[PDB]
Amino acid sequence: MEQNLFALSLDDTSSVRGSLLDTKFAQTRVLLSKAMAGGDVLLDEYLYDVVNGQDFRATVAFLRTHVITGKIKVTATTNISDNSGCCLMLAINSGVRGKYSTDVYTICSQDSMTWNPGCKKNFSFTFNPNPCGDSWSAEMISRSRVRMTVICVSGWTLS
Amino acid sequence: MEQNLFALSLDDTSSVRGSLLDTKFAQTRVLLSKAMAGGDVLLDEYLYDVVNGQDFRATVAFLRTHVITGKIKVTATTNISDNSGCCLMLAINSGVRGKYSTDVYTICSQDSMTWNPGCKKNFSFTFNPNPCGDSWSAEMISRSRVRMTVICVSGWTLSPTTDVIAKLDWSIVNEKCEPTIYHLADCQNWLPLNRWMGKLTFPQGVTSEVRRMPLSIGGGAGATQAFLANMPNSWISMWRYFRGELHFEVTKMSSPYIKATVTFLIAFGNLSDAFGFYESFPHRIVQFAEVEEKCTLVFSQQEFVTAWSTQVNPRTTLEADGCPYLYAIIHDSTTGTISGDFNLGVKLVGIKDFCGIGSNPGIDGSRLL
Amino acid sequence: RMPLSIGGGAGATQAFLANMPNSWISMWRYFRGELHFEVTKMSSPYIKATVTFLIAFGNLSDAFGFYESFPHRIVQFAEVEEKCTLVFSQQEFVTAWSTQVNPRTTLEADGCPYLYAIIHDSTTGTISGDFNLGVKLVGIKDFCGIGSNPGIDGSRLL
Amino acid sequence: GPVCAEASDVYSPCMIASTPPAPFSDVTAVTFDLINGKITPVGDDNWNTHIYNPPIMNVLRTAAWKSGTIHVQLNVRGAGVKRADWDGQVFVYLRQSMNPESYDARTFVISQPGSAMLNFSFDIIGPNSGFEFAESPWANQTTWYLECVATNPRQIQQFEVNMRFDPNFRVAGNILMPPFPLSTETPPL
Amino acid sequence: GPVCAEASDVYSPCMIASTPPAPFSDVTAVTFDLINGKITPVGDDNWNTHIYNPPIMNVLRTAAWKSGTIHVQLNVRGAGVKRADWDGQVFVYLRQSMNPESYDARTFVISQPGSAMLNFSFDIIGPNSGFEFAESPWANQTTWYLECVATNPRQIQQFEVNMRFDPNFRVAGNILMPPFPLSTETPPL
Amino acid sequence: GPVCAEASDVYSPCMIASTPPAPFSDVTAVTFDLINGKITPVGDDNWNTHIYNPPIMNVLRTAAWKSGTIHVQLNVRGAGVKRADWDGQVFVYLRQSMNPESYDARTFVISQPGSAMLNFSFDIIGPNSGFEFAESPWANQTTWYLECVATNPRQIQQFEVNMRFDPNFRVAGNILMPPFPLSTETPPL
Amino acid sequence: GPVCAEASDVYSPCMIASTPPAPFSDVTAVTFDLINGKITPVGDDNWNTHIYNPPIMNVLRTAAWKSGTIHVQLNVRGAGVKRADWDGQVFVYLRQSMNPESYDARTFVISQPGSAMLNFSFDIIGPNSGFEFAESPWANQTTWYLECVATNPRQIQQFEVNMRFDPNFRVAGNILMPPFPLSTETPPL
């Protein structure tokens, strides 16, 4: 009924402590091949461009809640069997210039991690797009056009 | 990196305490018109069918989190200006049968509320689809196909500005959902059922009114030699006559520009409206306002502490009319300063220890109310 | 996908099979309790996969937008690791589904939630292989059985 | 034998119908609903489901969530067909759907004259929160009915249904409701 | 079957009448009062409501406010119409008024020979102060009766009524009273 | 007599068969198993043990160690053979093997029409650890059956078997199992 | 009426015989022993006391001092003599000697078809130390028997005897014993 609930439990700000799954909202298969040219990019998308429309646990906040302030964390379940190991790196740096570059000495170095396509179970890398401090609104990398990746250097010599 | 996070902070169950907006996920304009046929449905959708795909604060949980357990609450910001008030009710009951019904004595009564298209700012009604208890998974009304509504009875006799269809907002609240039921062992404290029976189309001028009416109760209600069993009426009988302090809820679905004062009680429905001094029975009454409007009742056993029939037969009488009920009498000289006509509500949420017993092997004849 | 219907035993070419985990383990109608299974890697330390295990809705065909959308639990196999169990209760489904069925029961009218799984990871072998995943019911967490089923059968192809 | 004595309690019913034409064909049987809603059988009916609108009963008809004891019964009507110029069996088979699949819940005796009853009970119960309903899509259902025979129509005019709203009745319902007008009573003694 | 044994308690009745002429017409049924006052049916009666003036019974006839258990019954009389040169059904339907509106409270079996009883009870009760009476103008009422069939008169001579003044009988009455003289007993064995 | 009233509880059965050809010969009787496994009689059967696969029942069929109350019953089906153009007896004789040696455990009445039931119980029990089974070689055994008559086939079409899985049922079983597919229901009202 | 339902307990019998030739004469009745020893009637018997050697029963036959509940019964066998081409009464009269002096202890109903039972009990007891026996010379005695009618032999083939060794059975016996070999079972369905 009547209520100045115009404040109540409605002004939705929440820097969100969703369980890292009540926080989860992504769905994109990290590419993986054999007939391959040494450094093998298994993609380089965006932050906000990334997609528009992804049905998950933390949902409306992607562009709702306003600001939060933790690290945009990842874990990609991979593996294979037993025979040989390999190298991979995810790209995360700043905005862009023009027709730029795509490597492990490039795309990553802003903030990065290092993993193997068959090690026990998975790698970790908690992305916080702002170096300047912390907290964050939807733009800061959007209208500051950064793009991310995933790729070897080494590889499992045994394809 | 590596982690058996297969449990971690991932198995997402959460019966959710989102702020009633971190809970909000609806977006549908509640219909509103003028050139209108008395009872005017401003819709009757569904629960899950309702829509598929609605970008809001509580989001994935609609079909994710698993279960929660509060009341699916609503507040629809409406209004208009100042001139006249009106009645409206939202429908919420159970599943469906076949090509069913669409009214205020129908669609609502399972769990319901009562509002005016121009009262101060908004109405409340916290819907918890399960009566049986509380908690809830996505299905229970889906695969149990219930549909809800919004509509008058009365209306703002003064038809206004345009067709203001406001907003229908819900999701839930952390409230202690009350598991509704009704004790077979008839004589009982309190009463659940609700019983729809308001409004009273009152002329302007001061036609020397007193539009009587009983207080018989039973099953449901008519329609052109056709009737209607409901939840405020039938298990709410079985027994014969009914015996208890129940009380109604009147309201000013009429005017802050048209008033009237009408008693409410228990006298004798065998006295036609023209009595010498009708204000002659143990009183309670109207004296409406621009502000004031919703009203209730209260009529017990210091009062009638003796039986009348929750039933009737199409051939029951007045010049042989048993029992006392609420058959009202105005008082004041009715008005409008315009072109209007008054009204007056009626309802039964919970009694003061109700004596039901006996049974009625059967009839019907759904009293024209 | 696959359900979690339970009852009697199981098929064979229009032929079935009553057992001890299935029939006195019914009588009542639908079944209601935290039982849980036991998966295992009867597959590969050279082929892996990660497959959730739980209770969503067997009326959603495997191609959902983001299938990892129901209250999770899952695979991530090993050369060493392999045997796995389960655990799915009443904070979870604290409401009835049928330990029974009739050869003509449906999905586009499918009642209740069960374990109808979704991978996650990009399946492998570096060879010529193919994965797998177990399922079993030793002891529940307080099981509500009641009602009865006057009869049918139609031993669900599992 | 007949020490019929001290019988008791209160009883409501439902509708009332009959085993058919003359004109008419080969042995059938009335297979209608045992509680609510679609209340008629299949094929050559024309038995006229003379639907009554009982108290505790449309309450049945309008009782979605449904918990609570009932003591259903039957009894039959025939004619001036001498006890010897007679043979009028029947055998109840109430279940929860009925079909060339299914398996009927229960059965019940008779084989003699017109006014031959039966009276008992079906421990109602339910799934979600212990109560149930008419193949309502949540997990799945079935519902109440009964197979009230007809292995000789020039043997039995009518069929009698009756229902008992007991104490163990933790009801609910207010289902989404169409026609509940009346068809009460034509009294031709 | 017949382990008729240990039967019991005490029993009073009412009147006594019969299924009619020869001369006579097409299947009717006696529909009289189940307790007091106007005690006869309608139409082609001429059954002769051979009214008796029973103890606990005119007490019924003269019991306005009326609270207390009864174990009403019936039984029938016929003739030397061989068990095969027979067919004598009936089906009780007692209610509280009876009409082309109404819906009878109860029913009851039979279909065989002459001396075929029935015996039970109607939990009496009431409205005002828990007790009731013959459509007495306060809120409204209905009252007790029973529909004692007649679907073949050259099948059944008489009809038998009986009533049980129980312990749960919190009575009252002394209604305003006309004729209570007698018509006791003609004994023609 | 017929104060059939308040009947109750829940009931499952087994299979269903019938008293035979026309063609056909001299008075026989169906002597099949009363619980599990080999479920048919001997000699000129051709009655068609229309085996059903019941719940609590194949559970019987598949219940080796077997402890727990049952309320077995019977009832019969015939035809349009006037109550006078009738005579359809039977007398139950269930035991634990049956033979030109043995001595049947129990017996049971009837002699009238088609739909004539019976319903009771056999306090199941057992030897080793108080539970038993189908002449299972440990010390020795016997098992359940029943002799469901047939002293006139142009008198009785069918025979009805039914079983009650009670509370006092401390079961076990999972016997070594062959075919349990189905033969559910053909519904020809 | 027929709400035959939940029947129960365990039951053993005795022998088995039949109402006689064709050839044959005028209405007689089988008057044999109700427990032990000399187990046959008098006069034109030739009914063939097809003596069986039951468990709890020869135990009867061999139970001198005898204390303990029994639930004796009867039931009969006839033929394809239409329910109308029928009339088969009997009336039990068990006592303790039977003669043109004496006065039989009890009696019992029937009058219909072949398989018509009866089942009850005789509170056994005794004199010396509360237990008794077959006119055993200490103070004097009498003993158990029963008069199982025969007022029409081309009406009833067989007679059925049965006995219940109850809990209240404080037995004794080991009487001085002659032949207890067997005559078990000829099974001609």
Curated annotation (Swiss-Prot), chain C:
Location in the cell reads:
Virion
Q: Describe its PTM?
A: Not glycosylated.
Free-text comment on this protein's domains from its UniProt entry? Contains a beta-sheet structure called beta-barrel jelly roll.
Record text on subunit structure and interactions: Interacts with the mature small capsid protein. Homomultimer; assembles as pentons. Interacts with the movement protein (via C-terminus).
Query: What does it do?
Result: Together with the mature small capsid protein, forms an icosahedral capsid (T=3) enclosing the viral positive strand RNA genome, with a diameter of approximately 300 Angstroms. The capsid is formed from 60 copies each of the large and the small capsid protein. The large capsid protein interacts with the viral RNA.
Name the record gives this protein: Large capsid protein
Entire protein: shown range? 671 to 828 of 1046
